[PDB]
Amino acid sequence: YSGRVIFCLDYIIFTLRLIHIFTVSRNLGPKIIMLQRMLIDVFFFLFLFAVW
């Protein structure tokens, strides 16, 4: 069961790597580039929301 869990983790991280590949296309590359920074800022905002 632990190996199965680790395999699920491997699957999700492999999907993350797949997401990296899409950056080449002009259509959805800038979208991901923006998404990263938005994710950072949203993480900080959610941290503050979490605290109160």
Ligand X SMILES: CCCCCCCC(=O)OC[C@H](COP(=O)(O)O[C@@H]1[C@H](O)[C@H](O)[C@@H](OP(=O)(O)O)[C@H](OP(=O)(O)O)[C@H]1O)OC(=O)CCCCCCC
Q: Which positions touch ligand X (CB under 6 A)?
A: 22, 25-27
6: contact with its own copies by CB under 8 A: no
Q: How many residues bind its own copies (CB under 8 A)?
A: 17
| Interatomic CA distance for residues 18 and 20, integer angstroms | 5
| Interatomic CA distance for residues 6 and 12, integer angstroms | 10
22: contact with its own copies by CB under 8 A: yes
Show the tokens assigned to 8. 């699920």
| Interatomic CA distance for residues 44 and 51, integer angstroms | 11
Which residues bind to its own copies, rule: CB under 8 A?
Answer: 15-16, 18-19, 22, 27-28, 31-32, 35, 41, 44-45, 47-48, 51-52
